[PDB]
Amino acid sequence: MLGKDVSSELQKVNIALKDNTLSEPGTVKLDSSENLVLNFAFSIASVNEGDVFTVKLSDNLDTQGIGTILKVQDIMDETGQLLATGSYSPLTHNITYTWTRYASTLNNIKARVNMPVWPDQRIISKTTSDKQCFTATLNNQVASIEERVQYNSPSVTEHTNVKTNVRSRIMKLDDERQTETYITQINPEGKEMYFASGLGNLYTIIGSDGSPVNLLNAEVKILKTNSKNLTDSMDQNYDSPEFEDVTSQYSYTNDGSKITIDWKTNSISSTTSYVVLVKIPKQSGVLYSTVSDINQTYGSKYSYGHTN
Ligand SMILES: [Ca+2]
Ligand SMILES: [Ca+2]
Ligand SMILES: [Ca+2]
Ligand SMILES: [Ca+2]
């Protein structure tokens, strides 16, 4: 930036991070659709078209949650006209606002914004026992708040004849493509999984309760890794050396309502975990995943929902 960033000329600047909407202030429950709230305000005597100002967030804070939209809401004046448009950058964790031609015609502009912000699931990708520090800066004013970040734990069954564990999550909603990504972790706990003789192979069934979800066009990818490489948000680099693509090894059936994967064994070792990624058009409905027999009579089941 050589010039034109007007953040240093803003007056009466205020900025704050708040957690009033959390069910239990002190902890953000990312699997209970919780988030923090950012607000800021200022005045500015005049601006030029194309000038910018920047709201800086800490590296562990984003404007997205599970979304993919970079735009943030426009800033409007009292007449309902547009003062500035803005966008979030994954690179810098900054929100950059650009003043409009309309704004450049005014004098004594007031700006005020409220928006949700989330602990970034790619950065704080696992449940934390201790509080994390979240900050935002606008010129010389800074806000901070501390919160633990919590994700749900896996479903586990540990009996003599059946040992299973599983977890799933809708971890991405793509705005442009109108899709959702539903990820299933098989053996996220890194334990022995087992069905005793007479109980058949271990299977993973992916379906919906309500089956309102259409899976006919699902894109399915299956990866193998050690559990120590798995995050709780499931938003991680799946192209890394720690993951092997085994999609071709484990064929599946799909009747449009259920996807059934035969693991081809009654035993999965503690050091073997699988991740099944299912991408489908965005749809309302609660999806579930299992590690079970084909009839979902025994084993484990985890559910995760979404509403348009
Ligand atoms: Ca929510
Ligand atoms: Ca930064
Ligand atoms: Ca820490
Ligand atoms: Ca773990």
Author numbering: 317 to 526, 530 to 627
Paper text:
To assess whether Srr1 and Srr2 could support a DLL mechanism of ligand binding, we determined the crystal structures of S. agalactiae Srr1-BR and Srr2-BR at resolutions of 1.65 and 3.65 Å, respectively. However, Srr1-BR and Srr2-BR are more similar to each other than they are to these structurally characterized MSCRAMMs, with a root mean square deviation of 1.6 Å between Srr1-BR and Srr2-BR and root mean square deviations between 2.1 and 2.5 Å when either Srr1 or Srr2 is placed in a pairwise structural alignment with ClfA, ClfB, SdrG, or UafA. Notably, a bulky amino acid of the N3 domain (Tyr-623 of Srr1 and His-528 of Srr2) significantly constricts the center of each trench. In addition, we have recently shown that Srr1 binds to human fibrinogen via its interaction with the Aα chain of the protein. Sequence comparisons and deletion mutagenesis studies suggest that the interaction between Srr1 and fibrinogen could employ the “dock, lock, and latch” (DLL) mechanism described for several other fibrinogen-binding adhesins, such as ClfB of S. aureus and SdrG of Staphylococcus epidermidis. Deletion of the latch region of Srr1 is associated with reduced GBS binding in vitro to fibrinogen and hBMEC and resulted in attenuated virulence in a mouse model of bacteremia and meningitis. Alignment of the Srr1- and Srr2-predicted latching clefts with those of other DLL adhesins showed that Srr1 has closer homology to these other DLL proteins, as compared with Srr2. To address this possibility, we constructed variants of the Srr1 and Srr2 BRs, in which residues in both the latch and latching cleft regions were replaced with a cysteine, such that a disulfide bond would be formed, thus fixing the spatial position of the latch. Under reducing conditions (1 mm DTT), the mutant proteins had mobilities identical to their WT counterparts As compared with the WT Srr1-BR and the Srr2 BR, both cross-linked proteins showed enhanced binding to fibrinogen. These data indicate that the affinities of Srr1 and Srr2 for fibrinogen are enhanced by a pre-closed latch, consistent with the location of the latch influencing binding affinity.
GBS strains express either one of two SRR proteins, Srr1 or Srr2. We now report that both Srr1 and Srr2 bind to a specific tandem repeat region of fibrinogen Aα chain. As was previously predicted from sequence and functional analyses, Srr1-BR and Srr2-BR each adopt an overall fold that resembles the binding regions of “microbial surface components recognizing adhesive matrix molecules” (MSCRAMMs), including the well characterized ClfA, ClfB, SdrG, and the likely MSCRAMM UafA. Like other MSCRAMMs, Srr1-BR and Srr2-BR contain two domains, termed N2 and N3, with each adopting the DE variation of the Ig fold.
